[PDB]
Design a protein around this ligand. Sequence first.
Ligand code: CL
Ligand code: MG
Ligand code: MG
Ligand code: MG
Length: 775
Amino acid sequence: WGYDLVHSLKSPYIDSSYRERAEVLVSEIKAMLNPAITGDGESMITPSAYDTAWVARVPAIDGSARPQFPQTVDWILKNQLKDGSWGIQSHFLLSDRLLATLSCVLVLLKWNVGDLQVEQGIEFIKSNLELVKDETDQDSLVTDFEIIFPSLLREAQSLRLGLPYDLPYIHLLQTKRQERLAKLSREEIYAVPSPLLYSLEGIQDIVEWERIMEVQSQDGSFLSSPASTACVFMHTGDAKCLEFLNSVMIKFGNFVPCLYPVDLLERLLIVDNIVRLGIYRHFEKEIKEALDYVYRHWNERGIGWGRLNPIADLETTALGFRLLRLHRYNVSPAIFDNFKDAKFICSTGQFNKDVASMLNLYRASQLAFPGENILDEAKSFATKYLREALEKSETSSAWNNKQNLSQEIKYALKTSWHASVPRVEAKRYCQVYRPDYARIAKCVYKLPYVNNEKFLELGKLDFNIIQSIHQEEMKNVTSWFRDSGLPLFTFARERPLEFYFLVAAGTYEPQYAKCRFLFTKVACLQTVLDDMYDTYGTLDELKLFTEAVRRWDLSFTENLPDYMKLCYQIYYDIVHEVAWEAEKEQGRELVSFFRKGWEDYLLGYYEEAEWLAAEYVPTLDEYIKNGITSIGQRILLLSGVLIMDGQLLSQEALEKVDYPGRRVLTELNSLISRLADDTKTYKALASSIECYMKDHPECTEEEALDHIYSILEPAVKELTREFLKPDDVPFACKKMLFEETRVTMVIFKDGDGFGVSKLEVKDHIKECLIEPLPL
Ligand SMILES: [Cl-]
Ligand SMILES: [Mg+2]
Ligand SMILES: [Mg+2]
Ligand SMILES: [Mg+2]
């Protein structure tokens, strides 16, 4: 550990050639995304054999005995898989292959073509249906499979195709179809758009086609489904239906996907993945362009996966809410009212979509601002949903197991956005992100703009480069520390890497080296000052030191004990080095401001020192008042935030984030740090818990701990708002303050009082700063 460990590190990723390579990757990705974000190449989605077969059914509008879109028949004839099914070869999902294959067989028969493909298709369906022994063999189900497959199979039955219609699994599907159809309000089908519009081809006996046009989408589709739209067209001859089908053929050529467009969801997924991979700083322009488009279509009724959907989609809406708010767009949690009743619903559609909607709801709820009760309700609801999902057999399907769904749900539930280490989360996501990820709707599909090899290549390389740069900084840190004189204070533990980690794990960009360095110096000094005032020094000694603090005079130290003479000299040097660097960056005088800050901090220590000597137990109000100042976070944060390369803070701007006595960023961080620290420790000078109990002699320790949390939770919401709030404060500065708070909250998470785990601390440093990602 310390000096020897860090100086043993020799990372190759520091060479400029790696950053040059990363820049090529950035350019390639910008080129790849351009059609999606700026051009007309939006909605890049794979073919749906199932939907293509429905479109292939449409007869020529000229009344001749041939398909209107003969290219779709040719596509089907040419795209059968080796095993006789149709679908995406890389991923096998039984329900997807069954549905698509039966769909293709029937249309080939309609047009009396593809005898061999038909024979092979029928064989696939028959043989695979006969492998299903019990329900747990069916695997994950494509959207509305239980509704559609029985009706498609009855079509085959009327043609007397050689299929096993009398299998128990077939009877069970019909049973499930009835169960679904029973809860259907049929009169409302025509009045209120609903998810069933996505699958009208499966409920043809139920729908009055003469009434269905009222819930048609503006583009002529029925909930963006080519199959569902083709079905309505063949029943009605509706001109807008045909226009939608034409538009998809024009876009894709000789096939159609199972959803179109996916313009909103796709843009949000691109942004989400770029952000989670930790590579967002390279794509500011593209992310803004993507979210600007989503925001244009953001409305009080929520959003669908496509901008023309006549009903909102929880998955897309919750994802949009989170990304928009995170990028400082003004959105209101009242949009979640669109997904309520009587509260929340979303337990109807296909399983993966439902789970995705709730994971997104859960994540969105953590971005709550003060007074947003709907998000508290949302969090509770989504948590309960996800814990229940873990216990469902569907979660353990072959398909879901292959994608580690249960693991993903568990990770989300144990992970608090506020108590997260940013660099570590990006590192972990690089290890989970899948370039060839397959999604489920009416069929299995992929979105190559979202899931691709380049994103991951850049993610891993960028992480390694940043880490190698930090490793070189850590050599500088440990080298400075060794010669600094701080090691002479043997009453204080040496923690330079822990303090470096505190800032570096969140403020990681290469240009902020000085910020990280000075922040680390101040934190090392403070841990000595803290031990000196609250443990090692006597009140008479500490009184002398505190007088020296007032005087700012090196000559005055002749009065101090030897160890304090040294401590004062180091303190004085660090304060003024920081001040000099701040004045250089800011272009204005800051020595007096820093000096006042240090005086207030240490006078806070002295007040505490007086309390300790007197065995005085403060009121909670007194404890918190002192603690916000003496916890030391304010002056530490100032020693980093004012020295960020290129980030100018006027007095006016600074007061928006730093102002003793006001609930601004530095004050909230101080309060959160003090109380989170207490909740985590205190059981291992009185703490906030003990103080409250002196204030309320009758109350229990349990009540006391609950009260501290009742203070913490509101503070965290305020911190989030202060961070994300639109204003003219350089965002990099707000983010540095916020991210330092997040890492602090990681250190003190799950406050039971038993103390901080040193092994967890070292493990975080290992993961973040020491061990590279394998390439
Ligand atoms: Cl996958
Ligand atoms: Mg202390
Ligand atoms: Mg202490
Ligand atoms: Mg303590």
